[PDB]
């Protein structure tokens, strides 16, 4: 079987969650996926899975044990409010924002800089010219 143990439980009212260190004992196995940790920490601490965040998990040399950090928000909405974006995307709570690469965006920015005004009037002027 696999055991999970929470230690150093700190209550955090003004961010409305609980902090702790997760120790996962997994004999005869590689490790536990974060999703399974989230769902059962939800079961034990008795919160909805979405309010549960788990990260920073490292297995000890030789295997059989891992240690990470766990957060249990008082509500799903509170988790959505305070909790980092990239991790919500990890949990699917947020959708990945599609953006172009930094060089592309900077080129867009500079070329936008060289135009003045909306430019629609320039567009119609050149259209009439040609």
């Amino acid at each position: 079987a696999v055991t999970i143990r929470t230690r150093k439980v700190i209550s955090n009212p003004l961010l409305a969650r609980k902090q702790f260190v997760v120790d996962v004992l997994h004999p005869n196995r590689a490790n536990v996926s974060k999703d399974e940790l989230r769902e059962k920490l939800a079961e034990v601490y008795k919160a909805e899975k979405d309010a549960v965040s788990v990260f920073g998990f490292r297995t000890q040399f030789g295997g059989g044990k891992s240690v990470g950090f766990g957060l249990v928000y008082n509500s799903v909405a509170e988790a959505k409010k305070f909790e980092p974006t990239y991790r919500l995307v990890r949990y699917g709570l947020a959708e990945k924002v599609e953006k172009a690469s930094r060089q592309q965006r900077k080129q867009k920015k500079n070329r936008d800089k060289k135009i003045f005004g909306t430019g629609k009037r320039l567009a119609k002027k050149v259209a009439r010219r040609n």
Binding site: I10, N12, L14, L15, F82, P84
Partner: peptide
């Protein structure tokens, strides 16, 4: 206090007026 884990958390905390 070891309350916040990063500066962004501190900013959210401060704007919450707590």
């Amino acid at each position: 206090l070891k309350y916040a884990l990063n500066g962004r958390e501190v900013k959210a905390i401060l704007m919450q007026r707590h």
